[PDB]
Amino acid sequence: NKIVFVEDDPEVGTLIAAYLGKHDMDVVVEPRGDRAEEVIAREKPDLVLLDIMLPGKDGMTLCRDLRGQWQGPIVLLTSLDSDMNHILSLEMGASDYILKTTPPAVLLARLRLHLRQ
Amino acid sequence: NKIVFVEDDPEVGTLIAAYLGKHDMDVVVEPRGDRAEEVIAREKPDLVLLDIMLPGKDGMTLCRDLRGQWQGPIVLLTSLDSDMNHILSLEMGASDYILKTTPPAVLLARLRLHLRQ
Ligand code: BEF
Ligand code: BEF
Ligand SMILES: [Mg+2]
Ligand SMILES: [Mg+2]
């Protein structure tokens, strides 16, 4: 299964794409908010995994836009521990909001959860 | 909008029923694991909130038993901070697994999510 993962920090970007790899997932990592929407239009993935603090455009705005043009699981994933952000993401159409401090095995388990609708 | 809440602790049982009540959902609280299913069968709720450490029958076995015979959303809410439990219950057909430590406006935000999804 195919996952576009919009993330600046190239270290976590490869580390996560590595882990998700061992467990049978095709991960196209994008490090610009400006470039996603395009990459996401090209790669045509079945789930989309957004960071928040991106360069250029940002995660949450990116989420709001993507909600119109396409109707599949969008999952946020950020260092920003904000109850307000969490509650607003879900209001705008995100399917989950996950702290980066979540154990990878649990991040995998939720991604699998969403790739069932 | 109706929810049965299997939960032994009388204190959390009230706070959740009062809070979710203020927000226009009808919460029925059953304090025994072995008695839920019967309470669920009758009350015919829209979503099921399970504690894990319950008398009679634990929330996790109770969850996989519902899967055969009820197809609404089941949300675990527990004090049990365990990666294995979380990952296991997503795979046994729960829709979410929430630490009781989660702020209540965030709990509401997620329940509202599943009462659409
Ligand atoms: F870059 Be993430 F939002 F931590
Ligand atoms: F009793 Be519960 F599982 F916190
Ligand atoms: Mg960032
Ligand atoms: Mg208990």
Residue numbers in the entry:
A (entry chain B), B (entry chain A): 2 to 118
What does the publication say?
The RstB/RstA system is a ubiquitous TCS composed of the membrane-associated histidine kinase RstB and its cognate response regulator RstA. K. pneumoniae RstA (kpRstA) contains an N-terminal receiver domain (RD, residues 1–119) and a C-terminal DNA-binding domain (DBD, residues 131–236), with an overall sequence identity of 79% compared to RstA from E. coli and S. enterica serovar Typhimurium. As a member of the OmpR/PhoB subfamily, phosphorylation of the conserved Asp in the RD is believed to result in dimerization of the domain through a conserved α4–β5–α5 region, accompanied by the binding of the DBD to cognate sequences in the promoter region of RstA-regulated genes. Genomic systematic evolution of ligands by exponential enrichment (SELEX) experiments in E. coli have shown that RstA binds to the consensus sequence TACATNTNGTTACA with tandem TACA recognition sites.
The structure of kpRstA RD in the presence of BeF3− was solved to a resolution of 3.2 Å. Similar to the structure reported for TorR RD, four kpRstA RD molecules, which correspond to two dimers, were found in the asymmetric unit. The two dimers within the asymmetric unit had similar structures as revealed by structural alignment, with an rmsd of 0.47 Å over 117 Cα. Structural analyses revealed that the overall structure of kpRstA RD has the traditional (βα)5 fold of RR regulatory domains that consists of a central five-stranded parallel β-sheet surrounded by five-helices. In kpRstA RD, the BeF3− molecule is non-covalently bound to Asp52 within the phosphorylation site, and forms a hydrogen bond with the side-chain of Thr79, a salt bridge to Lys101, and van der Waals contacts with the backbone nitrogen atoms of Ile53, Met54 and Ser80. The interactions found in the phosphorylation site of kpRstA RD are analogous to those of other structures of active RRs from different subfamilies, underscoring the conserved nature of the phosphorylation site environment. The dimer interface of kpRstA RD has a buried surface area of 689.5 Å2 as calculated with PISA. Two conserved intermolecular salt bridges are formed between Asp97 (β5)–Arg111 (α5) at the center and Glu92 (α4)–Arg113 (α5) at the outer sides of the interface. Additionally, six hydrophobic residues (Ile88, Leu91, Ala106, Val107, Ala110 and Leu114) cluster together to form an extensive hydrophobic patch that holds together the α4 and α5 helices between adjacent molecules. Incidentally, the RD of kpRstA contains an extensive hydrophobic patch at the α4–β5–α5 region, which forms the dimer interface in the active form.
